[PDB]
Design an enzyme around this catalytic site. Sequence first.
Site, PDB file in Angstrom:
ATOM      1  N   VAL A  27      28.642  41.552  23.258  1.00 23.65           N
ATOM      2  CA  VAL A  27      28.379  42.173  24.369  1.00 23.65           C
ATOM      3  C   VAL A  27      29.490  43.279  24.727  1.00 23.65           C
ATOM      4  O   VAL A  27      29.366  43.971  25.502  1.00 23.65           O
ATOM      5  CB  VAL A  27      28.360  41.040  25.474  1.00 23.65           C
ATOM      6  N   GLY A  28      40.149  43.959  21.868  1.00 23.31           N
ATOM      7  CA  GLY A  28      39.145  42.852  21.422  1.00 23.31           C
ATOM      8  C   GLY A  28      37.860  43.082  21.455  1.00 23.31           C
ATOM      9  O   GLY A  28      37.471  43.625  22.339  1.00 23.31           O
ATOM     10  N   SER A  29      36.863  42.400  20.565  1.00 20.05           N
ATOM     11  CA  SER A  29      35.624  42.420  20.629  1.00 20.05           C
ATOM     12  C   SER A  29      35.059  41.323  21.676  1.00 20.05           C
ATOM     13  O   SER A  29      36.089  40.107  21.665  1.00 20.05           O
ATOM     14  CB  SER A  29      34.948  42.261  19.234  1.00 20.05           C
ATOM     15  N   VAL A  30      34.048  41.181  22.181  1.00 21.95           N
ATOM     16  CA  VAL A  30      33.647  39.913  22.952  1.00 21.95           C
ATOM     17  C   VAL A  30      32.062  39.664  22.733  1.00 21.95           C
ATOM     18  O   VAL A  30      31.249  40.804  22.461  1.00 21.95           O
ATOM     19  CB  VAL A  30      33.717  40.677  24.538  1.00 21.95           C
ATOM     20  N   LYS A  45      36.337  36.276  23.505  1.00 21.59           N
ATOM     21  CA  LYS A  45      37.076  37.366  23.257  1.00 21.59           C
ATOM     22  C   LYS A  45      38.068  37.251  22.178  1.00 21.59           C
ATOM     23  O   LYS A  45      38.800  36.295  22.274  1.00 21.59           O
ATOM     24  CB  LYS A  45      38.123  38.116  24.399  1.00 21.59           C
ATOM     25  N   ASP A 158      41.124  41.875  34.934  1.00 20.12           N
ATOM     26  CA  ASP A 158      41.761  42.900  33.943  1.00 20.12           C
ATOM     27  C   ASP A 158      43.016  43.326  34.738  1.00 20.12           C
ATOM     28  O   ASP A 158      43.369  44.734  34.977  1.00 20.12           O
ATOM     29  CB  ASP A 158      40.625  44.101  33.471  1.00 20.12           C
TER      30      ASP A 158
HETATM   31  O1  LIG Z   1      41.011  39.687  28.173  1.00 19.82           O
HETATM   32  C1  LIG Z   1      40.598  38.618  28.936  1.00 19.82           C
HETATM   33  C2  LIG Z   1      39.066  38.817  29.336  1.00 19.82           C
HETATM   34  C3  LIG Z   1      38.774  39.640  30.182  1.00 19.82           C
HETATM   35  C4  LIG Z   1      37.297  39.822  30.292  1.00 19.82           C
HETATM   36  C5  LIG Z   1      36.452  39.003  29.698  1.00 19.82           C
HETATM   37  N1  LIG Z   1      35.037  39.112  30.212  1.00 19.82           N
HETATM   38  C6  LIG Z   1      34.295  38.212  30.841  1.00 19.82           C
HETATM   39  N2  LIG Z   1      33.109  38.642  31.023  1.00 19.82           N
HETATM   40  C7  LIG Z   1      32.840  39.618  30.297  1.00 19.82           C
HETATM   41  C8  LIG Z   1      31.594  40.346  29.937  1.00 19.82           C
HETATM   42  C9  LIG Z   1      31.707  41.519  29.145  1.00 19.82           C
HETATM   43  C10 LIG Z   1      33.072  42.005  28.709  1.00 19.82           C
HETATM   44  C11 LIG Z   1      34.167  41.271  28.874  1.00 19.82           C
HETATM   45  C12 LIG Z   1      34.260  40.091  29.639  1.00 19.82           C
HETATM   46  C13 LIG Z   1      36.634  37.877  29.053  1.00 19.82           C
HETATM   47  C14 LIG Z   1      38.205  37.981  28.735  1.00 19.82           C
HETATM   48 MG   LIG Z   2      38.234  46.693  33.233  1.00 23.15          MG
END
Ligand SMILES: OCc1ccc(-n2cnc3ccccc32)cc1
Ligand SMILES: [Mg+2]
Length: 342
Positions: A27, A28-30, A45, A158
């Site tokens: 969808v 670091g990589s996530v 992530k 964030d």
């Molecule tokens: O770095 C911590 C952190 C930040 C954002 C997220 N996150 C939650 N839902 C998401 C959907 C898309 C991309 C990132 C996403 C997870 C972890």
């Molecule tokens: Mg952002």
Amino acid sequence: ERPTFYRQELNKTIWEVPERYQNLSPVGSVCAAFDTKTGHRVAVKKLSRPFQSIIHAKRTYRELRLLKHMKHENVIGLLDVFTPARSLEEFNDVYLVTHLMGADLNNIVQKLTDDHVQFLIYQILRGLKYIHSADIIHRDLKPSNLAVNEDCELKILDFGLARHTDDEMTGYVATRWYRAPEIMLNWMHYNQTVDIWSVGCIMAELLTGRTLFPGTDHIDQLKLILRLVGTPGAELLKKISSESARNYIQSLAQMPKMNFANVFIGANPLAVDLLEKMLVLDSDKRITAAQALAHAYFAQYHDPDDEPVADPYDQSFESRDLLIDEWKSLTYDEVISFVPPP
Ligand SMILES: OCc1ccc(-n2cnc3ccccc32)cc1
Ligand SMILES: [Mg+2]
Ligand SMILES: [Cl-]
Ligand SMILES: [Cl-]
Ligand SMILES: [Cl-]
Ligand SMILES: [Cl-]
Ligand SMILES: [Cl-]
Ligand SMILES: [Cl-]
């Protein structure tokens, strides 16, 4: 007991995760996933090169400490953190798990009623009261860092981890349009008041549909700001530590503060009043999050018995000088001590 892990390559990346996480898709990589323990869809992530330098190792520790502390309805929280490593000696990878976020405020900003603006800004301030009570400064509030769902419910995410670079803040870019002037131009040691400036910029944009200060560079943006709120008086000028910046400001022709009712034409007078109290050049004089929650604009949502504050947050590590492997061992301790929420 340690869970069973399984491996798989997803878009040139090896992912090794507990069996509870299923149907991973980039969808670091996530990756998005289904969590069979909680029933939620989640984001997983995998941190990229978390311990490659002293700066990177400390930043990994900083992010994990912050995410472990945040426990509030209007702030992103941590559902899980894990490593496939069995010992400190083979520790190398860190994975973070949160609720899966869909739209941000941009994807919602539709025709917004004044009731929508009240509810969205109320939730931002409720989360900020919590964040600020722990002596944390977000530093990067902007629409892409606010997640919103179908029921208009909002979470802040964030946090600024001291990351953003010089190239990222240059030119006609949304990464700078929401920043307080004293931090945009390094006028002074800043504090939590910078976040309230950002909330004012966001609120103005929800009311008008337009960016408030879309500067083409730092100086163009400063000129847009000073045209609205006026040039500084001697009281604020004293507080700018750079003799150079003081000389630049005094080079500009003096301008009075504009009439906000003639800028935000047709807006709720209570919204105009609140904007005048957020968008104040001298950061010492801006309204605080706790004060803003009690403003009449939020009368239909304000509940002083349901606006909680945070547990104390020890940031003494920020002034500490350690080796890469000492930052790494501190991070390992925080991974293995994680306790999930109810
Ligand atoms: O770095 C911590 C952190 C930040 C954002 C997220 N996150 C939650 N839902 C998401 C959907 C898309 C991309 C990132 C996403 C997870 C972890
Ligand atoms: Mg952002
Ligand atoms: Cl499992
Ligand atoms: Cl590992
Ligand atoms: Cl604190
Ligand atoms: Cl944005
Ligand atoms: Cl003048
Ligand atoms: Cl703490």
